[PDB]
Design an enzyme around this catalytic site. Sequence first.
Site, PDB file in Angstrom:
ATOM      1  N   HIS A  87      54.371  42.825  63.155  1.00 63.31           N
ATOM      2  CA  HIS A  87      52.960  42.562  63.217  1.00 63.31           C
ATOM      3  C   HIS A  87      52.715  41.099  63.526  1.00 63.31           C
ATOM      4  CE1 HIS A  87      52.058  46.242  60.536  1.00 63.31           C
ATOM      5  NE2 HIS A  87      52.280  46.547  61.811  1.00 63.31           N
ATOM      6  N   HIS A 102      57.669  45.084  58.692  1.00 61.77           N
ATOM      7  CA  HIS A 102      57.849  46.119  57.695  1.00 61.77           C
ATOM      8  C   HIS A 102      59.102  46.867  58.071  1.00 61.77           C
ATOM      9  CE1 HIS A 102      53.640  45.523  56.412  1.00 61.77           C
ATOM     10  NE2 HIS A 102      53.481  45.196  57.660  1.00 61.77           N
ATOM     11  N   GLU A 161      55.151  51.469  60.072  1.00 65.46           N
ATOM     12  CA  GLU A 161      53.862  51.834  59.478  1.00 65.46           C
ATOM     13  C   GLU A 161      53.153  52.825  60.413  1.00 65.46           C
ATOM     14  OE1 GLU A 161      51.981  48.104  58.057  1.00 65.46           O
ATOM     15  OE2 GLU A 161      52.817  48.850  56.137  1.00 65.46           O
ATOM     16  N   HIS A 189      56.276  40.527  49.389  1.00 60.14           N
ATOM     17  CA  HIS A 189      56.128  41.838  50.029  1.00 60.14           C
ATOM     18  C   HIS A 189      56.771  41.853  51.387  1.00 60.14           C
ATOM     19  CE1 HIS A 189      51.896  40.346  51.478  1.00 60.14           C
ATOM     20  NE2 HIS A 189      51.968  39.867  50.270  1.00 60.14           N
ATOM     21  N   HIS A 236      55.048  39.014  60.739  1.00 61.24           N
ATOM     22  CA  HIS A 236      55.898  39.561  59.710  1.00 61.24           C
ATOM     23  C   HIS A 236      56.342  40.937  60.151  1.00 61.24           C
ATOM     24  CE1 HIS A 236      51.930  41.108  58.785  1.00 61.24           C
ATOM     25  NE2 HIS A 236      52.592  42.224  58.455  1.00 61.24           N
ATOM     26  N   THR A 253      47.121  46.502  56.450  1.00 56.73           N
ATOM     27  CA  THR A 253      47.938  47.529  55.836  1.00 56.73           C
ATOM     28  C   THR A 253      48.455  47.178  54.467  1.00 56.73           C
ATOM     29  OG1 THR A 253      50.061  46.927  56.773  1.00 56.73           O
ATOM     30  CG2 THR A 253      48.655  48.404  58.114  1.00 56.73           C
TER      31      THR A 253
HETATM   32 ZN   LIG Z   1      51.979  44.128  58.521  1.00 57.70          ZN
END
Ligand SMILES: [Zn+2]
Length: 257
Positions: free
Chosen positions: A116, A93, A103, A61, A91, A195
């Site tokens: 994050h 997104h 996010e 992911h 990590h 999340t």
């Molecule tokens: Zn995250």
Amino acid sequence: HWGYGKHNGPEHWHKDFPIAKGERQSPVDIDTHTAKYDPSLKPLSVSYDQATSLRILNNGHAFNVEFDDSQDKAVLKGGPLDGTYRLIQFHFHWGSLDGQGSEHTVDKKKYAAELHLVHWNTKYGDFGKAVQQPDGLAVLGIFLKVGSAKPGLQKVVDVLDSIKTKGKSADFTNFDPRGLLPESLDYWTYPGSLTTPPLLECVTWIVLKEPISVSSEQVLKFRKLNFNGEGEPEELMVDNWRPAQPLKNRQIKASFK
Ligand SMILES: [Zn+2]
């Protein structure tokens, strides 16, 4: 079998994880005019000088840069937090296009990506116990916009070819996360959740106001990663963000006037 596709994306997660429709889900839109300055917050203390990175992993992911969290080496304290939170991993997104990927949003604005830095409260002993507590985690969120390169990101970008596909890891020692931080530590804070599934409502979010700049070439490399495993049909790891969730009975506080 959750993910970010049509048939398994955010809008489906509630079937396996009913907490997706809970009272303190993340991310949220940060309405800057309704956030209120809270003079009783402190400055954040971000103490990363002894951080020991170990490894980078494509988990299907995102990619996680993992740290040694067996001592208080890279810790977050202060701000809204009571006590000491140890860095376990960071990590990102990101989007398929520069106009999306974050996010959290700010006045409905989407950034190209969001970093994050995940920390767990030492009073709970281990990450797995911490995520079962309402004050278990502190996540420092940092927006990425496309412009100038971020020099401190390049070591991450350059290893990505070695972890293209799900389940691949690579040694990743001596990486300094201080090179991912903006100048200012001004922030917004609110109580929320992971999340990603299991979406546990265990996070104090600390979202920095100042984005970092990364180059188009850097984000392009993120977008060459794969969600799939080696020898499976190639699906680019893009648009691995959950959209904003209802704020419900929460107030977002600002550290700054
Ligand atoms: Zn995250």
